[PDB]
Design a protein around this ligand. Structure first.
Ligand SMILES: C[C@H](C[C@@H](C[C@H](C[C@@H](C[C@@H](CCN1CCCC1=O)N1CCCC1=O)N1CCCC1=O)N1CCCC1=O)N1CCCC1=O)N1CCCC1=O
Ligand SMILES: COc1cc(CCNC(=O)c2nc(Cc3ccccc3C(F)(F)F)[nH]c(=O)c2O)ccc1O
Ligand SMILES: [Mn+2]
Ligand SMILES: [Mn+2]
Length: 180
């Protein structure tokens, strides 16, 4: 109770995003008021996913991240049962209607190389595209296919470095970087 991080998080992110992160955490046992670095990470992840879907066309993406567990899986099965793609082992973040694949978004506080390797080994189902973002500005996509145009990805990187800065200016950055 009474952490600087928790007050910064609800100040940095959109209320609807904070609410979705809150609900997503409690659904999986975590508590936003003690596990505040996770709380911070979940909002960043959520916002990155939303900006990602904001790239490209209006019908381009179907957002899986943000929905509750059961409806998310329901949309996945509908997407698999209509497009023929194989159902993924873990819940993905997006489905690309133009490129006919699921997308797994990553936000990491280490060199993009390791995190990609870990998530590429977490699913091992292939097909499911992986797109990794770092807080420094590095990105990382399967087959070097970065899906969106450069300007849409540059927006995401810019926002990620703004979050890093606001955290450091309040001295929460170092603890946040170590929590992963
Ligand atoms: C569609 C609806 C909610 C969407 C949420 C998602 C987030 C969006 C916020 C909006 C406001 N915008 C758009 C302009 C800027 C802004 O701030 N963006 C985009 C940028 C960052 C951000 O926050 N979008 C995208 C379309 C409109 C909208 O709201 N979600 C939540 C999870 C699933 C989903 O589709 N749905 C669908 C049914 C339940 C529900 O709530
Ligand atoms: C409560 O926490 C969250 C739960 C959800 C619903 C399903 N979880 C993901 O979809 C997801 N989880 C993570 C990190 C994480 C966090 C908790 C458990 C497991 C994992 C993972 F094993 F995946 F590493 N990183 C993503 O990129 C990612 O898409 C979404 C965002 C969250 O913040
Ligand atoms: Mn996800
Ligand atoms: Mn993800």
């Amino acid at each position: 109770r009474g952490s600087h991080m928790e007050d910064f998080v609800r100040q940095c992110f959109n209320p609807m995003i904070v609410e979705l992160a809150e609900k997503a955490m409690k659904e999986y046992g975590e508590d936003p008021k003690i596990e505040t670095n996770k709380f911070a990470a979940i909002c960043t992840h959520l916002e990155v996913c939303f900006m990602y879907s904001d790239g490209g066309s209006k019908h381009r993406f179907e957002i899986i991240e943000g929905r509750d567990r059961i409806m998310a899986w329901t949309v996945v099965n509908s997407i698999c049962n209509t497009t023929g793609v194989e159902k993924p082992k873990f819940l993905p973040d997006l489905y690309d209607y133009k490129e006919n694949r699921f997308i797994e978004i990553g936000v990491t506080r280490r060199e993009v190389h390791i995190y990609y390797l870990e998530k590429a080994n977490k699913i091992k189902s292939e097909k499911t595209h992986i797109h990794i973002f770092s807080f420094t500005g590095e990105e990382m996509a399967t087959k070097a296919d970065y899906t969106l145009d450069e300007e849409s990805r540059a927006r995401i990187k810019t926002r990620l470095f703004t979050i890093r800065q606001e955290m450091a200016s309040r001295s929460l950055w170092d603890s946040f970087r170590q929590s992963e």
